[PDB]
Amino acid sequence: GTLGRAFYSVGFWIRETGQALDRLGCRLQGKNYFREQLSRHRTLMNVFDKAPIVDKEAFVAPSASVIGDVHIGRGSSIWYGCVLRGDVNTVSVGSGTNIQDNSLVHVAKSNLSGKVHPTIIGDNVTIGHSAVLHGCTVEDETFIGMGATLLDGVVVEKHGMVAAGALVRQNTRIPSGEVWGGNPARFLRKLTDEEIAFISQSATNYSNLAQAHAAENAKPLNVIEFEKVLRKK
Amino acid sequence: PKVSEDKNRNYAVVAGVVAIVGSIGWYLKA
Amino acid sequence: DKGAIEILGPYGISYTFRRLAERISQ
Amino acid sequence: GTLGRAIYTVGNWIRGTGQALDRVGSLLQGSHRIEEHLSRHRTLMNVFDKSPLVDKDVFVAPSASVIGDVQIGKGSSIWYGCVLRGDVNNISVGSGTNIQDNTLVHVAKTNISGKVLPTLIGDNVTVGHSAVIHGCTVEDDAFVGMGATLLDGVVVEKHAMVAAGSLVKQNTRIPSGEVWGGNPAKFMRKLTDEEIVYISQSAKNYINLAQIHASENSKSFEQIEVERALRKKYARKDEDYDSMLGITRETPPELILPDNVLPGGKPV
Amino acid sequence: PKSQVTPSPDRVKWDYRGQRQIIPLGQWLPKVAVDAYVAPNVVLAGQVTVWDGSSVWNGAVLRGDLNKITVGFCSNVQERCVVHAAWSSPTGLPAQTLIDRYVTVGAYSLLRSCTIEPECIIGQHSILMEGSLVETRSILEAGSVLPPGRRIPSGELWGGNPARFIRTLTNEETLEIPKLAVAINHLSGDYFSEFLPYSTIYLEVEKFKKSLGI
Amino acid sequence: GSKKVSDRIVKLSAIDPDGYKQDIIGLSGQTLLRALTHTGLIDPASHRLDDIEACSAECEVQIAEEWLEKLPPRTYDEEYVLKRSSRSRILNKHSRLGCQVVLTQELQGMVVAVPEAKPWDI
Amino acid sequence: PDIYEGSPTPVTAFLSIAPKISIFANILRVFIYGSYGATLQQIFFFCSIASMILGALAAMAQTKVKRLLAYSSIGHVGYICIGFSCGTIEGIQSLLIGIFIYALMTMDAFAIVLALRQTRVKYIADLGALAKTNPILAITFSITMFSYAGIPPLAGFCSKFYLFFAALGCGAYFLALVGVVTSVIGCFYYIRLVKRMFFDTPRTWILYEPMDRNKSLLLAMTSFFITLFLLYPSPLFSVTHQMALSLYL
Ligand SMILES: CCCCC/C=C/C/C=C\C/C=C/C/C=C/CCCC(=O)O[C@H](COC(=O)CCCCCCCCCCCCCCCCC)COP(=O)(O)O[C@H]1[C@H](O)[C@H](O)[C@@H](O)[C@H](O)[C@H]1O
Ligand SMILES: CCCCCC(=O)OC[C@H](COP(=O)(O)OC[C@H](N)C(=O)O)OC(=O)CCCCC
Ligand SMILES: [Fe+3]
Ligand SMILES: [Zn+2]
Numbered sequence A: 001g002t003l004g005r006a007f008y009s010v011g012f013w014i015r016e017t018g019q020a021l022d023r024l025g026c027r028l029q030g031k032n033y034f035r036e037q038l039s040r041h042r043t044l045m046n047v048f049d050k051a052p053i054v055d056k057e058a059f060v061a062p063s064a065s066v067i068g069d070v071h072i073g074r075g076s077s078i079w080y081g082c083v084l085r086g087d088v089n090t091v092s093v094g095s096g097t098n099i100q101d102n103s104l105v106h107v108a109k110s111n112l113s114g115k116v117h118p119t120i121i122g123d124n125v126t127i128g129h130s131a132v133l134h135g136c137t138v139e140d141e142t143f144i145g146m147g148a149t150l151l152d153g154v155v156v157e158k159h160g161m162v163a164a165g166a167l168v169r170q171n172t173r174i175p176s177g178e179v180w181g182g183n184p185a186r187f188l189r190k191l192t193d194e195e196i197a198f199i200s201q202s203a204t205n206y207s208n209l210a211q212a213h214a215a216e217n218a219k220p221l222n223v224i225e226f227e228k229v230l231r232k233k
Numbered sequence B: 001p002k003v004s005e006d007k008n009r010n011y012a013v014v015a016g017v018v019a020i021v022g023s024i025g026w027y028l029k030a
Numbered sequence C: 001d002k003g004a005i006e007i008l009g010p011y012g013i014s015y016t017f018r019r020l021a022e023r024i025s026q
Numbered sequence D: 001g002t003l004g005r006a007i008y009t010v011g012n013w014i015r016g017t018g019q020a021l022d023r024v025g026s027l028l029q030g031s032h033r034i035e036e037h038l039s040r041h042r043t044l045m046n047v048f049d050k051s052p053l054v055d056k057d058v059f060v061a062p063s064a065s066v067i068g069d070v071q072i073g074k075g076s077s078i079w080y081g082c083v084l085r086g087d088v089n090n091i092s093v094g095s096g097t098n099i100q101d102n103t104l105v106h107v108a109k110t111n112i113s114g115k116v117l118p119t120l121i122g123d124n125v126t127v128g129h130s131a132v133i134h135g136c137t138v139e140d141d142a143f144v145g146m147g148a149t150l151l152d153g154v155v156v157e158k159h160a161m162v163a164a165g166s167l168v169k170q171n172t173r174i175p176s177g178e179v180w181g182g183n184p185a186k187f188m189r190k191l192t193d194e195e196i197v198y199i200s201q202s203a204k205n206y207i208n209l210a211q212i213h214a215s216e217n218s219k220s221f222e223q224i225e226v227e228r229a230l231r232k233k234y235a236r237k238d239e240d241y242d243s244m245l246g247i248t249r250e251t252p253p254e255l256i257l258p259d260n261v262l263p264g265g266k267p268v
Numbered sequence E: 001p002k003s004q005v006t007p008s009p010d011r012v013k014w015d016y017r018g019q020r021q022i023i024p025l026g027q028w029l030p031k032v033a034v035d036a037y038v039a040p041n042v043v044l045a046g047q048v049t050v051w052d053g054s055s056v057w058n059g060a061v062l063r064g065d066l067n068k069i070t071v072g073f074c075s076n077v078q079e080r081c082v083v084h085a086a087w088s089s090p091t092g093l094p095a096q097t098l099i100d101r102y103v104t105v106g107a108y109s110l111l112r113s114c115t116i117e118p119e120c121i122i123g124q125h126s127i128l129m130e131g132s133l134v135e136t137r138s139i140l141e142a143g144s145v146l147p148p149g150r151r152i153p154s155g156e157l158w159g160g161n162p163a164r165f166i167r168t169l170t171n172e173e174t175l176e177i178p179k180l181a182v183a184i185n186h187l188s189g190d191y192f193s194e195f196l197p198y199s200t201i202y203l204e205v206e207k208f209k210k211s212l213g214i
Numbered sequence F: 001g002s003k004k005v006s007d008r009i010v011k012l013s014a015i016d017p018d019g020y021k022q023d024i025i026g027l028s029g030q031t032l033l034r035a036l037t038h039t040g041l042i043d044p045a046s047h048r049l050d051d052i053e054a055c056s057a058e059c060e061v062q063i064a065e066e067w068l069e070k071l072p073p074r075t076y077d078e079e080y081v082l083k084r085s086s087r088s089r090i091l092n093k094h095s096r097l098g099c100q101v102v103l104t105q106e107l108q109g110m111v112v113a114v115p116e117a118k119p120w121d122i
Numbered sequence G: 001p002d003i004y005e006g007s008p009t010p011v012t013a014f015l016s017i018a019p020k021i022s023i024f025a026n027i028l029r030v031f032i033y034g035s036y037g038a039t040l041q042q043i044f045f046f047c048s049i050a051s052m053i054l055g056a057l058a059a060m061a062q063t064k065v066k067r068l069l070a071y072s073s074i075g076h077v078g079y080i081c082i083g084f085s086c087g088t089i090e091g092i093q094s095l096l097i098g099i100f101i102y103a104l105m106t107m108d109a110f111a112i113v114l115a116l117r118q119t120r121v122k123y124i125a126d127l128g129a130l131a132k133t134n135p136i137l138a139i140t141f142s143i144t145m146f147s148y149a150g151i152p153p154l155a156g157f158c159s160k161f162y163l164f165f166a167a168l169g170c171g172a173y174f175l176a177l178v179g180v181v182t183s184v185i186g187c188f189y190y191i192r193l194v195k196r197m198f199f200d201t202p203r204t205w206i207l208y209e210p211m212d213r214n215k216s217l218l219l220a221m222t223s224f225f226i227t228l229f230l231l232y233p234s235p236l237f238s239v240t241h242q243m244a245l246s247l248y249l
Helices: A002-028 A193-217 A223-230 B007-029 C014-025 D002-028 D193-217 D221-233 D239-245 E171-192 E201-211 F032-039 F076-084 G002-006 G009-015 G018-034 G039-059 G065-085 G089-119 G137-149 G156-169 G173-198 G213-227 G234-246
Strands: A065-072 A083-093 A104-106 A119-121 A132-134 A178-181 A186-190 D065-072 D083-093 D104-106 D119-121 E043-050 E061-071 E082-084 E097-099 E110-112 E120-122 E138-140 E156-159 E164-168 F009-015 F021-027 F060-063 F095-097 F110-113
Touching: A002 D002, A104 A119, A119 A132, A193 D083, B007 D002, C014 G039, D104 D119, D193 E061, E097 E110, E120 E171, F009 F032, F021 F032, F076 F095, G002 G009, G002 G065, G009 G018, G009 G065, G009 G089, G018 G039, G018 G065, G018 G089, G039 G065, G039 G173, G065 G089, G065 G156, G065 G173, G089 G137, G089 G156, G089 G213, G089 G234, G137 G156, G137 G173, G137 G213, G156 G173
Parallel strands: A065 A083, A083 A104, A083 A119, A104 A132, D065 D083, D083 D104, D083 D119, E043 E061, E061 E082, E061 E097, E082 E110, E120 E138, E138 E156, F009 F110
Antiparallel strands: A178 A186, E156 E164, F009 F021, F060 F095, F060 F110
């Protein structure tokens, strides 16, 4: 609460004093390596007490940005370039889902539009590439198309598919088994059994692929590359 | 590498230490 | 209020300082 | 000598005290802040015994992520935030074909439609910002507008344009000379010769522009500090004092860009 | 036909420094105000000016290599927005990508040589092409695209892929427009206090170097 | 159709002091000084504000005799600003203020002659 | 006014303060012997009245910041010369207190001007939206302007107060009325500037770059002096009374 924030700010004051002392000590010895412009990006960033809770068996790409109260289930994956920012409210990501590359799942930034609805993602939910989920709530075993732009107040029912490039307007419900596409989103066709089976299999395929990507991302950082960058003439 | 190489910067450090010590003594001795 | 009190007040005719301050360039 | 050793020891003591203060301040924060770590983002990364074949002259931005079986030709460039995930199948970027900022190029699972083929982007093609490519076969000398989405199965033929903010549906062929666009991605109009000249000039301009970014994103720490000092030193000028002193301060070559990126090639 | 590439043996596959946020191009150095919040994931290349109270969020790229890019007072560029400038615009006006005060740019917005007058709201997935003017006190709906040379009249709501007129904004909406920018500024200031002036990553670099000698 | 920026584009002919005629582009609804600033004829740092009280005739222009009837008449403030900065306290009878001329679609092809520059640093 | 406008701003800051203290010291050390038939008291009487009137009536017709500062300096010179016109210990003391307060206010105002001079501020309308971009620099400049005006709570009121007291001590009632009218006019054209910063809503804004540490500290110290001088004004009065007596013994 307010008592915790005071201790947090005092912690920043003391940490800043300590860092200044360390820089002064480096300057006496002649070193200037603190001036190096290193990237300050953190894949898991906290806002005071709100910190992302990521399951151990969940692949989060190093370039993905997860901020605030974000919950990641077991078997889920947040791929490269994703920005999952939930600060005013929570972003709940289920188990088996896959936020694919360059996707955005964020909550509203202000109360002017009204109440900030938390973003909820079900289980085995396939978010497409460059899909913007802004305060919506999708049920489990659903599919969100590539380039979709779901707005807030939107409920995507179980086994519901949002077509690629679609923009679902505010306070819209997609019924189960129906495909909604176009701008604005409108009913197009009913899902077939083959598409349902493919949707079910895509989640498992990406869950298995995320394990390989995590294994390739957990390897020790190469020292040859580090030495090569150090000596540039 | 346990040596500070810059002679001019070392003299500035010595002068700053002398200034701080002298200021403390000045505020204490008088 | 809107007449004699205002005209003889601060802005009905006391705004001649605009016709007086601008003449200081002489 | 002895004074230098004493000052070094004092600096060591000060560094130790500062790190202790940093630890104490971190403790008072409640250990809620996640500490910044060394960058673990790999620009080029292998997935399944497969390595990218980026050419020597290609400019790959440090924030880009070339992943898996990606083959990139000479003169092309991959810009900031761009992702080329070729883990499942092959991605082949042609010569001079630049993929712009935040663009995503990903290949299908080789079975998304049964007879899927790799993503073959041709030569001298330019792809706009935030575009999404998911298994297309863009032929050489083409234009994909920023924000355009190309689903799997589409083929952009030579000298064809996809309008910005379009959604090319699967198994859609854009004929040569058309400017197909819109969310349904329907026929808009025919391309004029000025548009073709513009496409070629934009491709060449981006080829010429990638070089300064490549030369800036690969500098060492020592060169960066020197360039920063020079930039600060020559930020503001005083011609009067220079004339009074009889000198003429000239901007160092490290702060001069080639005339091929200036708006109209300004030598002076 | 070549079908032949020559991999470079000095190419770096992992930059321990990460991506540098401020990328100067020759003598053009991006200028960021001390009151402005720029996310650590942001890339600012070329001549890009960020003013007081402004904020740039995660994944945004502001490449001012060709022309000038300016972000105004209390105007925000949200997540994963690409702002780029061209040499010239079709309309003949200068092609500098200029954003005035109290302008809210929604996420996934692609701005190129567009000029946005003060107190405007740009929706998500909006694309503003070369030489497009958005007049003051106007709102552009999410997912709306306007071709080059198009103009959004002041005080109107526009949306759609070939952006069309929807309705006329009331007084309450056109007066709450700057309040959204102020609220986003407050949120950006909340994010701004999480970062100290200097990072502590150089200690990790020194530890890594010590693990390999020097 | 749709709302084009060209729907409010005002074509003008501006003559810089050495007698060269170049075509400038402006927007109907903005001051003529803004239109001159786009190309760079008038230094934007000298007249950053389009306001009467923040002006010392740094935006002075010479409008054509036949092109002056299709303009609002000069106000008292405009004349007062014009007289003081003339360096001779004389009126040219065809010189207007750039910040006080608002472009209009009826001003298509107006010929304007920009006089020589004057110091404004301090 | 032309010299003040054309001179560089850091130069104008020095000429507005330093050449006045020394010259006023010389004038005092001339009055200690040159009081020949109260001849200077009449000359300074007319000069002070004319200076107050002309400064008040000329600073209302100024659109540039530096010309307004020059005319403010002329008006304050007249206000100080009020003390010369009344030759007494309490007149010289009022004169010295006015010099001190005016010098501090002038240093404050010129530091503020130099802070905005990095963005080439020339007109009063330029500092239009300063209450939005830098909402603390606007407060500091408004405090300085009110101190120039002579609003009671600020430090600029004490000098004018005690100068008017000294003027009424010698019995010059005509000086008091002229001072009052000039004070009204000055306060009007000083709050005119405060109107621009906070109340106007200009279409185009000018954004200024933040100042450095030296001017920030100087502004902070001078602004704390101006607002909180009335709480503890004893040392200034004591030193001023000691100086005034020591002019003769
Ligand atoms: C946790 C409980 C404690 C918690 C409290 C902890 C307290 C720590 C103890 C003392 C704190 C000392 C505070 C004194 C700080 C003074 C300011 C630091 C001054 C300083 O930049 O350093 C030297 C300068 O040299 C001096 O010209 C003047 C420098 C002379 C002063 C340096 C002498 C420092 C020795 C202090 C005695 C240490 C004795 C041991 C202390 C540790 C205990 C074991 C480095 O120059 P430099 O060219 O490489 O670089 C500077 C520097 O970058 C900036 O000032 C400018 O940007 C640049 O232009 C350049 O000037
Ligand atoms: C107890 C901590 C002493 C730490 C001493 C110290 O760091 O001096 C630097 C500071 C800030 O000055 P710099 O611009 O060099 O920032 C330099 C910045 N630190 C950086 O690393 O970039 O000086 C002061 O204002 C303090 C004056 C009073 C000093 C007592
Ligand atoms: Fe003007
Ligand atoms: Zn995919």
